[PDB]
Design a protein around this ligand. Structure first.
Ligand SMILES: Cc1cc2nc3c(=O)[nH]c(=O)nc-3n(C[C@H](O)[C@H](O)[C@H](O)COP(=O)(O)OP(=O)(O)OC[C@H]3O[C@@H](n4cnc5c(N)ncnc54)[C@H](O)[C@@H]3O)c2cc1C
Ligand SMILES: Cc1cc2nc3c(=O)[nH]c(=O)nc-3n(C[C@H](O)[C@H](O)[C@H](O)COP(=O)(O)OP(=O)(O)OC[C@H]3O[C@@H](n4cnc5c(N)ncnc54)[C@H](O)[C@@H]3O)c2cc1C
Ligand SMILES: [Cl-]
Lengths: 435, 441
């Protein structure tokens, strides 16, 4: 095996198939012999957004859980066939250890060797040191909450991140009271001045309870309900989700035996081109420690592929204007800088917003909530950011990002002919407010 | 009354946008609309808004009457909204009544409570199109015959719907009432279904319609429309057909016969369309024409581009024209929608260029499995000599949003690899364009 990929991650999934067609003889290793395709397929966005779509429709929660199951099972088998149908790939099953820079121990047991090694072990949930989180019924993480038999009446969230907002909106539409608990003073502290307030009013109208400055010190199960204690105060919920955040999973590999350095939270430090301390080993995706997304992982594969099979090289520092989306209802999609970030630099700017009641396509789809906010730099007529909170905003931001990356001025989306009726054509109105 | 610096005939898209634009500059604007139920124009009351609203409810399998009631309140909101966008500015006179030309300058507005006469330094024609009624005996007398207008006000869903003709507007109602739970029968008078799209595309979309119980009878021109036994009866050269409701979907041609443009010097053609410039002038001076009356594309976005052309001339930034148009996109809002831009594979194969045709089935789009609609296709055409793309055929859910990403790369002339290497948003419909252009070999 010249190429050995540890993990069925997005970058590794794509790297293995690409190398086999280039004449390489690849072996990918994976621990979860029942959940292929990586976290994106089984645990991540695919199962989350499959239920999110069901929630907006107000469908039975249990039947929607089964519909996720057939969807996850359909894509899991396909992801395994993409790697097994290829001849030069063997999908060995089992967890992996590092014996040496070129040798791997994998679980009865196997000794697989390789000239090149590529790690895609990803990240995993990091639950805080709270007394009671160890042994308490009703406490679930992102994985365990997706397999819930019944729909709770009151679901509490431990975290105010973007993952906690997705589940808060998801269960609110299902019919459950949701309580979000983040220890911060500001809801969504990395968001704009008024965007977070708009998201707040959208959540609170659906019964969501945003508790700020919260501190949790004990978790028990008093009389059929989970208890969240906050110094002479208790919250009774039927199920508790932890939205703590994920950190790279590079502990069961023993990276010391291969001379691979990791940082303070376990992320294998990498070169601008994803080279690690070991000269012939790469690391793509969440183990890098960069943005924790499926497209950042795929773009890591494009970086390692341009090295192995391509002329010259592209690095990670050409990654400009990386977009992200919070798949609540309606979804928030962001790219570029915020209003706080735009003014933080000594370049004057223009910021006007467009209400969603002014988009006729929003009335067609029966959801007229949110705001369309974009930032234009009057010194070069270029766009420095946009925050679109409306229907299909995840589709919309791709137009906004592609124009920024090309360096084009705002006047293109102001005069471009979009289809009708659509949400992307709102940019005709959104950028006509620029003077 | 006094002379107006600009008068607009019709509450259409270009006319309504121009009225608020000229009044903002201080012009004396007058917009004449012949019906109170047409404030905001065709798109608000009869076109996109009330049709797209029922398609959204149809895809969710909502009750029919519950959707019709929701449709009415959407148009009644936006209609009242569009009346007040214009009737609230002191420089806009929202005059009701049918407008008839008397001169290059004067204009008769037919008010049933006494006629009025309005003069204008500049006149802007914008009266849109009216539905074409094919010359077939029995259409205007049989009670179960509906235009696109009268079908959107139905009381409850019919058990069998008959679409007279194909076309985009025809197929639009075919997927809506079928999804509402009703057998639909599209009777196109042609040898091929959707004759101006590719066959592979047209076959896929006929399979999506047939699986919902919609039979496409071709090579059929009707002779007599009767009402034998409680159903509209349609007579052809082969087996006759019966429907609980017949929908005519033959097209719309410009409304100009009531304007009488002969008295002002404005020229018309045989179908009745105002002859226009590249800057939308007519044969008469200080008189323009905007929208479907010009005989051009009958899209709301083209009508608004018409506004950009006349706004550039009037309010002054040099001048632009209809020659600026290229790669105009369009969508056919069925379920899933068919969005198109650029050339078809036929014209590609006919051009003789060095060409690559790439195809990605929607069943390979993970976002389609998330939205529970894996039907349709994704097709594109690139040129091997220039790395540009000639056209695109996206048949999938939310294709009306991705067709704009494609059109933006084509008008900038950037190579196909722009969409191949691009950090999209996950999970989305647009990210599967990464995998569509990775197929080029
Ligand atoms: C609830 C949730 C929602 C999310 N929503 C989104 C979203 O909307 N958008 C977005 O862009 N991202 C989202 N993500 C993140 C996304 O799932 C990942 O960031 C993305 O899949 C990156 O994966 P990766 O390339 O790092 O490899 P991963 O797919 O993370 O790799 C994990 C795989 O490697 C295997 N593995 C792990 N350790 C070992 C080992 N030692 N030996 C062998 N195999 C091993 C695991 O069994 C698993 O199959 C979400 C994540 C979660 C948990
Ligand atoms: C069923 C259907 C679906 C459609 N779907 C789409 C779609 O998905 N996308 C898209 O882009 N377009 C679509 N269209 C087309 C779009 O709705 C219109 O064609 C577009 O608004 C162009 O209108 P206009 O600007 O020319 O003026 P219009 O709004 O068409 O007409 C202007 C107004 O002038 C008035 N008028 C007429 N005669 C006179 C007179 N003598 N005096 C005074 N006033 C008069 C009429 O009341 C009319 O409302 C659709 C049309 C229909 C019928
Ligand atoms: Cl064209």
């Amino acid at each position: 095996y010249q190429a050995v990929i540890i993990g069925f991650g997005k970058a590794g999934k794509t790297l293995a198939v690409t190398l086999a067609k280039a004449g390489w003889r690849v072996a990918l290793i994976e621990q979860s012999n029942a959940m292929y395709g990586g976290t994106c397929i089984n645990i991540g966005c695919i199962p989350t957004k499959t239920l999110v779509h069901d929630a907006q429709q107000h469908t039975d929660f249990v039947r929607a859980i089964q519909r996720k199951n057939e969807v996850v099972n359909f894509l899991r088998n396909k992801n395994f066939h993409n790697l097994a149908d290829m001849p030069n790939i063997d999908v060995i099953d089992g967890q992996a250890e590092f014996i040496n820079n070129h040798s791997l121990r994998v679980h009865g047991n196997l000794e697989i060797h390789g000239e090149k090694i590529f790690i895609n072990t990803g990240a995993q949930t990091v639950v805080p040191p709270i007394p009671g989180i160890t042994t308490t019924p009703g406490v679930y993480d992102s994985t365990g909450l997706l397999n819930l038999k019944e729909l709770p009446g009151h679901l509490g969230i431990l975290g105010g991140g973007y993952i906690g907002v997705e589940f808060a909106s998801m269960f609110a539409n299902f019919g459950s009271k949701v309580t979000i608990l983040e220890a911060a003073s500001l809801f969504l502290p990395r968001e704009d001045r008024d965007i977070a307030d708009n998201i707040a009013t959208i959540l609170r109208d659906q019964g969501v309870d945003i508790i700020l400055n919260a501190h949790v010190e004990r978790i028990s199960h008093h009389e059929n309900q989970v208890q969240v204690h906050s110094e002479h105060a208790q919250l009774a919920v039927d199920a508790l989700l932890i939205a703590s955040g994920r950190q790279p999973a590079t502990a069961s590999l023993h990276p010391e035996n291969a001379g691979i350095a990791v940082n303070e939270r376990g992320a294998t430090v990498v070169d601008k081109r994803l080279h690690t301390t070991a000269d012939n080993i790469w690391a793509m995706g969440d183990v890098t420690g960069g943005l924790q997304f499926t497209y950042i992982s795929l773009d890591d594969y494009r970086i390692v592929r341009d090295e192995l099979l391509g002329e010259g090289k592209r690095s990670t520092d050409d990654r400009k204007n990386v977009p992200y989306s919070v798949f609540m209802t309606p979804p928030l999609s962001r790219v570029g800088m915020t209003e706080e970030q735009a003014r933080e630099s000594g370049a004057d700017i223009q910021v006007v917003t467009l209400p969603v009641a002014a988009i006729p396509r929003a009335r067609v789809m029966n959801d007229t909530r949110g705001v369309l906010k974009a930032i234009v730099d009057n010194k070069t007529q270029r766009m420095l950011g946009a925050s679109l909170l409306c229907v299909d905003s995840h589709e919309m931001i791709n137009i906004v990002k592609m124009v920024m990356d090309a360096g084009l001025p705002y006047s293109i989306l102001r005069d471009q002919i979009f289809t009708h009726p659509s949400m992307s054509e709102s940019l005709n109105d959104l950028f006509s407010l620029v003077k």
